[PDB]
């Protein structure tokens, strides 16, 4: 959780961390 | 989605909570 911008799949690296094995529903586009 | 708030600016870990089931 370092102060970094989440662009592209980067945000996905912070989403799975907020959930865990549960998973998450990101809304990417590319 | 949360990219216009996290990719552009550094959001908090609480904003990604809604991204969990």
From Swiss-Prot, chain A:
Result after altering residue 10 to D: In HPRI; Providence
Effect of residue 24 to S: In HPRI; Los-Angeles
Superkingdom assignment: Eukaryota
Effect of residue 22 to Q: In MODY10; reduces binding affinity to INSR; reduces biological activity; reduces folding properties
Annotated protein name in UniProt: Insulin B chain
GN (gene name): INS
